[PDB]
């Protein structure tokens, strides 16, 4: 599925996204739009040998299984398969313990360097929420 920005920004308010460990809800819009743009069944092999998945862009070294990333680890408990859904549940509380580990949302590239210091509140402008 691929989202409207706002429809996206109103299915990660409901699912508890908007100041999560104090990001606000546009940080999380402007990762998906860099990370995925917007959509849901994004896949993207890394140079290590493993494949981001989802809107998030979420990674199988650490956070899903794909069955093809050796050495690696399964911390959200999901097949990766399970970041491609149209319904974003899965990568929402995937996100939620990523972003509770240590270096917040420095964890999604797209964020760092595309979103971090910038007027991010632009991308629910707009929006009814
Ligand atoms: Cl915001
Ligand atoms: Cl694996
Ligand atoms: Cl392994
Ligand atoms: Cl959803
Ligand atoms: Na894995
Ligand atoms: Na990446």
């Known amino acids: 599925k691929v989202f409207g920005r706002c429809e996206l920004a109103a299915a990660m308010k409901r699912h508890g996204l908007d100041n999560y460990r104090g990001y606000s809800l546009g940080n999380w819009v402007?990762?998906?739009?860099?990370?995925?743009?917007?959509?849901?069944?994004?896949?993207?092999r890394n140079t290590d040998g493993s494949t981001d998945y989802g809107i998030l862009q979420?990674?199988?070294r650490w956070w899903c299984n794909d069955g093809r990333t050796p050495g690696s680890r399964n911390l959200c408990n999901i097949p990766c398969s399970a970041?491609?859904?149209?319904?974003?549940?899965?990568?929402?509380?995937?996100?939620?313990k990523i972003v509770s580990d240590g270096n917040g949302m420095?964890?999604?590239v797209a964020w760092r360097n595309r979103c971090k210091?910038?007027?991010?509140?632009?991308?629910?402008?707009?929006c009814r929420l």
């Open 106 to 108: 420095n964890a999604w």
């Open 117 to 126: 210091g910038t007027d991010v509140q632009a991308w629910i402008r707009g």
């Open 58 to 60: 979420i990674n199988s």
């Open 30 to 44: 402007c990762a998906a739009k860099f990370e995925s743009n917007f959509n849901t069944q994004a896949t993207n």
């Open 83 to 96: 970041l491609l859904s149209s319904d974003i549940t899965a990568s929402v509380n995937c996100a939620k």
